[PDB]
Amino acid sequence: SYELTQPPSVSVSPGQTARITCSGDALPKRYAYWYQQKSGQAPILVIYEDKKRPSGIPERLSGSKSGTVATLTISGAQVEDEADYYCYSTDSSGNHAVFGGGTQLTVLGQPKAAPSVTLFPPSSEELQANKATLVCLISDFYPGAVTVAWKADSSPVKAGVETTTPSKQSNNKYAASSYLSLTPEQWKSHKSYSCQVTHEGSTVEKTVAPT
Amino acid sequence: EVQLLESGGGLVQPGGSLRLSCAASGFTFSSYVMTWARQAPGKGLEWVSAISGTGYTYYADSVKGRFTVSRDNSKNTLFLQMSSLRAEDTAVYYCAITMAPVVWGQGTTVTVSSASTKGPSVFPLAPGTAALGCLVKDYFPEPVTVSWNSGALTSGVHTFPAVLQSSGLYSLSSVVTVPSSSLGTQTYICNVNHKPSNTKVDKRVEPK
């Protein structure tokens, strides 16, 4: 199958120019098209026919093509430009279209943002059903890497933890959640449980207790 | 106003069939190629199929012989008949205008799996500010919708991406930050909709 090759990742300083390439053997005879997809959104067409800009797309975005390489250029980069960019074209036969693998654009220089952490104990309705879940919610942090540790009183919890991978929010920060499964008896028989979230060396701890 | 309204997605067992539909308005539908594309969870965009106004049809190699694209110009509707479905066909499916998608539908989710749908169990997460929430536990497949107070409460709402449990079921949580003074004066209800199981439940969240 005909394929278009894009770098998986490009980074750019604020105010500088990002260049995202897309290579394919049929590009010298086939138009390139470019799409922007922000997290949790449908894609938007940003360039068509190598270089044409739909009305409303910023003038900072331009497209060009030379030989087997199409390039999307984003000048004066802003944090709002963070997104996945996909090129799109047709094969030598002209009977199939294809997207490139996508390029994630990172805008450098964004400040550290510490997570906001909320911990909930099991609900009475869940405990009545012989189950117990503790819910640790971690939001608005940057960069997108945290570690989560659970404690029973002060002792490390080694089983029952499921933690999501950080996901980019619409505001370019990250969110994650961690769930601790316990028996009702484990919940009742400890003085407290804590969720401890470490980010950029800083540890935040939230604690809940049976009541 | 150009509108593309998609329907027909859902959970289907491997080897099953599904018919996606895309009802168009706001443009002269018969004048344009219409395109299907898809995006698997966490993966890139993929071109699926295209059909010209007069009915010429084009297909990705990954779906040729299994999918049939069609259209009804008199009803401004585009179809994708999917057969011999495989796990790798799981994706959000988009319709779009012209051979280079210019205006995209909002998508319809197709899940190909042998596991039966499981509706969620919804648990209240009791509370200058305070946080309260709802735990939407043990459901399959994605996605699920959470609103608060029938959509009237949007400030302070954060609904988190789901965790995929080792059981193969999903769970997610939605939390709302509210003024702490409102805990005794205001009622908070989370509204959960899990479409594959036709689950629509409201759960009141009261201070403990």
Partner: peptide, 22 residues
């Protein structure tokens, strides 16, 4: 007979932008 190429419909995009916004 053979179908024309998918690319033979490319100019519809320009037509679209004649009549509609992005």
């Amino acid at each position: 007979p053979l179908q024309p190429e998918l690319d033979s419909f490319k100019e519809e995009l320009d037509k679209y932008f004649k009549n509609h916004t992005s």
